[PDB]
Ligand binder design. Structure first.
Ligand SMILES: Cc1cn([C@H]2C[C@H](OP(=O)(O)O)[C@@H](COP(=O)(O)O)O2)c(=O)[nH]c1=O
Ligand SMILES: [Ca+2]
Length: 129
């Protein structure tokens, strides 16, 4: 896989962000995770966590997987990095997302994320508390 440039336009919630990619605004849905909706338990903390990560970053990057690059809603499907740290993984490591939506062909980072989830759960963090 390859990292490509993007710039933040706006934080949305725990697992969606609006980025400018190839000069066009698009909403990205983070691969292989599910955050709670803002209205649900840990939803606000997930949203805040992603927001801080993306807003504090000097360099945002998009990494597409091998599969589908857009979903049925028009959202970009990619892993998102903030100064080299994957947001998708970080949310899972902190117990603020579950590994989820694992589809054939877009699952390169599955086992990385599962390992993070196991550690969050062992620590009883947030969702796992
Ligand atoms: C993360 C992800 C979501 N989706 C679709 C499946 C779900 O459809 P439904 O809307 O029909 O439930 C929805 C979940 O996204 P959200 O968790 O953002 O709601 O987005 C994909 O198709 N591919 C993906 O990789
Ligand atoms: Ca969600």
């Amino acid at each position: 896989l390859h990292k490509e440039p993007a710039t933040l336009i706006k934080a949305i919630d725990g697992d969606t962000v609006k980025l400018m990619y190839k000069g066009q605004p698009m909403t990205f849905r983070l691969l292989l995770v599910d955050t709670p909706e803002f209205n649900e338990k840990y939803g606000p903390e997930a949203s805040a966590f992603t927001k801080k990560m993306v807003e504090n970053a000097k360099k945002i990057e998009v990494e597409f997987d091998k599969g589908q690059r857009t979903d049925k809603y028009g959202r970009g499907l990619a892993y998102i990095y903030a100064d080299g740290k994957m947001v998708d993984e970080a949310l899972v490591r902190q117990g603020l997302a579950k590994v989820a939506y694992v589809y054939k062909g877009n699952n390169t980072h599955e086992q990385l994320l599962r390992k993070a989830e196991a550690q969050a759960k062992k620590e009883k963090l947030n969702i796992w508390s």
